[PDB]
């Protein structure tokens with residue numbers, strides 16, 4: 767089982783839900799958390815953990831890791847739990863900042879129907895993922911990998927692509943072990 771239902775009497779549940787509603791902005795009043803589930807994929811967790819340690823040694827930017835959101839469709843949920851996030855299933859809607867997996871800093875964005883469309887029961891899927899944003903650069907329509915660092919840098923590419931280099935709200939990640947789905951929020955409209 768890649769999904770374990772979290773009980774409301776736990777601190778883990780209350781931290782996920784508090785962080786969700788804090789970033790829900792104008793939607794805070796219009797969205798109800800139905801269910802919270804822990805995502806279990808030990809191989810990815812362990813691989814993510816190694817990636818994390820190498821970025822802590824290397825990166826000029828702190829923090830190396832952010833807790834971001836990813837709204838998805840109901841049929842894509844078993845895929846992410848079992849295999850993690852896959853940039854090859856770019857079907858979703860668009861890839862205006864590159865052909866990667868899109869993460870939002872605020873649940874207010876991921877909770878929009880175009881990202882988390884409700885099923886027939888009105889349940890909307892929003893993954894909580896630990897993402898290794900690292901050193902980021904500007905996203906663009908052509909990107910198949912992170913943006914180029916350009917002159918003044920030893921490395922050729924950044925770790926992630928962003929919507930705005932000044933005040934980022936969207937992060938695009940282009941590596942299979944760079945984002946770890948830790949929870950699934952099943953929410954709905956009031």
Ligand SMILES: NC(=O)c1cccc(N)c1
Pocket residue numbers: 835836837838868869870875876881936937
């Ligand atoms: N699918 C998503 O949650 C998401 C997050 C940030 C930006 C975009 N376009 C989508």
